[PDB]
Amino acid sequence: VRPKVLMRLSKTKKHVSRAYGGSMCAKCVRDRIKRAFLIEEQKIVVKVLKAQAQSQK
Amino acid sequence: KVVNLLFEKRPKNFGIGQDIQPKRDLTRFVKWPRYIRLQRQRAILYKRLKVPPTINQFTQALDRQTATQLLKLTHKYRPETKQEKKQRLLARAEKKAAGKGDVPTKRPPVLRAGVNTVTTLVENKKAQLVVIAHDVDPIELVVFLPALCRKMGVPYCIIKGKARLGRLVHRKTCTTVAFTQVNSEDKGALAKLVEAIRTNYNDRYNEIRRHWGGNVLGPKSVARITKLEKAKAKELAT
Amino acid sequence: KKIRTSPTFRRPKTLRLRRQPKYPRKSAPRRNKLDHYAIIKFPLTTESAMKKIEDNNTLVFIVDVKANKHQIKQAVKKLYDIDVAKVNTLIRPDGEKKAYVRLAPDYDALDVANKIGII
Amino acid sequence: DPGRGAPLAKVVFRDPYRFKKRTELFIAAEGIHTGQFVYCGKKAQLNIG
RNA sequence: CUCCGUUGCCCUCGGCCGAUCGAAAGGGAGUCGGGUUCAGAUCCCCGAAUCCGGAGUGGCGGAGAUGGGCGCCGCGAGGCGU
RNA sequence: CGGGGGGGCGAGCCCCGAGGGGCUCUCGCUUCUGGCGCCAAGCGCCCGGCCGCGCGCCGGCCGGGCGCGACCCGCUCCGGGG
Ligand SMILES: [Mg+2]
Ligand SMILES: [Mg+2]
Numbered sequence: 001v002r003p004k005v006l007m008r009l010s011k012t013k014k015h016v017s018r019a020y021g022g023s024m025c026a027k028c029v030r031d032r033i034k035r036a037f038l039i040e041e042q043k044i045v046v047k048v049l050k051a052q053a054q055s056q057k
Numbered sequence: 058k059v060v061n062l063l064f065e066k067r068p069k070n071f072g073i074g075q076d077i078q079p080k081r082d083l084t085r086f087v088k089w090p091r092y093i094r095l096q097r098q099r100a101i102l103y104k105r106l107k108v109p110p111t112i113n114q115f116t117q118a119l120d121r122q123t124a125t126q127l128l129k130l131t132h133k134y135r136p137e138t139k140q141e142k143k144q145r146l147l148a149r150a151e152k153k154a155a156g157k158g159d160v161p162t163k164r165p166p167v168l169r170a171g172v173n174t175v176t177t178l179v180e181n182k183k184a185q186l187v188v189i190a191h192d193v194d195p196i197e198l199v200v201f202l203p204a205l206c207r208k209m210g211v212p213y214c215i216i217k218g219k220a221r222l223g224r225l226v227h228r229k230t231c232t233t234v235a236f237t238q239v240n241s242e243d244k245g246a247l248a249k250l251v252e253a254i255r256t257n258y259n260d261r262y263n264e265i266r267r268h269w270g271g272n273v274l275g276p277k278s279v280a281r282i283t284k285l286e287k288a289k290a291k292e293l294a295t
Numbered sequence: 296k297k298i299r300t301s302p303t304f305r306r307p308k309t310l311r312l313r314r315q316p317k318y319p320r321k322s323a324p325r326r327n328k329l330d331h332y333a334i335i336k337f338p339l340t341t342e343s344a345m346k347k348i349e350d351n352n353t354l355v356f357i358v359d360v361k362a363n364k365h366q367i368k369q370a371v372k373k374l375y376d377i378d379v380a381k382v383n384t385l386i387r388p389d390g391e392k393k394a395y396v397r398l399a400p401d402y403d404a405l406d407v408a409n410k411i412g413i414i
Numbered sequence: 415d416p417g418r419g420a421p422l423a424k425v426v427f428r429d430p431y432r433f434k435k436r437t438e439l440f441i442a443a444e445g446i447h448t449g450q451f452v453y454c455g456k457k458a459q460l461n462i463g
Numbered sequence: 464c465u466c467c468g469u470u471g472c473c474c475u476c477g478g479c480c481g482a483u484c485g486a487a488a489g490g491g492a493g494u495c496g497g498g499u500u501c502a503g504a505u506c507c508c509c510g511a512a513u514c515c516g517g518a519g520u521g522g523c524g525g526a527g528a529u530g531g532g533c534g535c536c537g538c539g540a541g542g543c544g545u
Numbered sequence: 546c547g548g549g550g551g552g553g554c555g556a557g558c559c560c561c562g563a564g565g566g567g568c569u570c571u572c573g574c575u576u577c578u579g580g581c582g583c584c585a586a587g588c589g590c591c592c593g594g595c596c597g598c599g600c601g602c603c604g605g606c607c608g609g610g611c612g613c614g615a616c617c618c619g620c621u622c623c624g625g626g627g
Contacts, residue, residue: 280548
């Protein structure tokens with residue numbers, strides 16, 4: 001519905017109750033979860049591979 | 058353990074592309090307005106260019122030890138303030154019609170402020186000590202005075218601040234100042250400053266008139282030109 | 296040592312005071328000229344205005360061209376000891392501003408018309 | 415863009431001074447695709463884009 | 464002068480991007496049916512609506528919230544203390 | 546930015562007592578994936594109020610301030626010409 005109408009409508013009509021709800025499509029949310037996972041996990045892996053490369057040298 | 062286990066560290070690291078950078082001082086990276094940017098690189102052109110000696114003598118000045126005595130000597134001779142001049146006339150209008158006032162009284166010795174008051178009584182050999190402020194805006198006004206001084210055998214000095222010299226006389230600024238006479242008791246300190254000054258200023262003109270005062274590069278440049286003289290040195294010194 | 300975090304120099308926010316006039320610029324206040332007797336010129340008695348009175352419970356007025364609907368309501372209320380439901384203005388060709396004034400349901404227009412002398 | 419034979423590319427960095435997202439328009443080198451990481455600067459490595 | 468409002472000053476925060484004008488066919492919330500005049504009607508009347516702003520003191524209900532545990536007292540529904 | 550100085554994983558060279566130190570370089574630390582990123586943690590040093598020990602720069606409760614974190618000094622905002 002035309003944008004200035006979103007002022008009359010209620011909160012639940014404008015979103016959907018999730019993370020990033022009403023702004024992202026939940027096929028790209030469930031990716032942004034398990035992408036924000038392994039980015040951190042392989043930062044831990046490089047952290048210990050860097051801590052073993054300096055422990056060896 | 059008086060430490061709640063939750064207080065951890067979260068230390069940030071501001072490497073390039075790492076966590077966002079914090080706020081440091083930037084006073085050397087600021088878009089300053091066209092009047093600041095002007096007056097700062099006015100004081101640079103005043104160092105980069107080769108300055109003539111007569112404008113340059115006003116850079117070298119008196120020191121904390123000499124200037125404080127001068128500024129103490131004058132505090133016994135400040136010209137009558139207003140409302141202090143009022144009681145010099147008012148007390149004479151009552152003393153005249155009551156107690157035998159001839160009213161010639163001996164005007165106590167005081168300073169003299171302006172340029173075309175001093176340059177008259179130095180051209181007349183009528184001044185013991187002349188004090189020159191170093192920062193007069195049209196330097197034209199005092200460019201000549203030191204040479205006029207030592208040609209008449211009068212001890213001149215260059216002190217810092219046209220403000221604090223214009224603070225003995227009750228004004229905002231004042232370029233010169235001069236003692237014509239001094240009280241007999243104050244004669245000791247006057248003769249002491251005099252010899253200490255003309256040893257540094259009057260008997261020095263053939264070092265001042267032949268002294269140019271600029272030609273220094275900026276340190277960003279000096280570090281570069283001297284870094285090629287550790288290369289040329291270590292080329293035929295090793 | 297108040298470090299400059301932004302590389303811009305926005306001018307500092309100086310104090311500025313209020314006007315303290317030694318004299319009033321003009322002596323006396325201009326007396327108001329859209330009054331309750333100069334906002335209502337004269338009521339219309341047209342056959343298509345009386346037909347508006349007895350049927351619609353309104354009154355037709357000619358009214359000074361500078362008048363608001365709020366201004367017209369507060370004057371019709373001030374003069375004829377009346378009370379107004381809503382005010383409808385137009386501007387006739389010839390430039391005189393008509394104003395159909397709808398009186399509240401408890402108030403009768405065929406009566407207050409006789410007081411103001413129109414019929 | 416109209417009037418130009420080359421395609422442009424909206425490349426999103428993030429300003430390393432204030433929390434924000436600077437966005438540019440680079441004349442796209444042939445091979446650039448959507449989602450590629452474009453690196454910039456002196457320490458960057460030599461490959462397309 | 465409760466608490467709230469207002470204002471004065473001190474600290475704190477604030478990128479823009481251009482003073483302003485430019486569409487009765489672009490962008491732009493919300494009105495429809497019946498009736499009425501000699502001439503006006505989505506504009507008058509009747510009947511249904513509707514948006515935007517205000518609603519402070521909050522006008523009223525509803526939501527936030529009405530649990531659980533423990534401990535007693537009570538046949539039990541239950542009551543109290545924590 | 547230019548000098549400096551810090552730092553140090555590390556490399557070249559010099560010194561070395563094998564602990565380390567000096568000169569040079571490297572760095573100012575982010576490269577597999579359409580992720581997140583600010584308004585300071587942590588530490589230090591103080592002060593106001595309140596409570597407790599009472600000697601209160603002792604300890605607790607409430608509330609603030611400055612320094613390190615985020616190295617120091619400068620003279621052209623940084624570059625390219627002249
Ligand atoms: Mg919904
Ligand atoms: Mg306009």
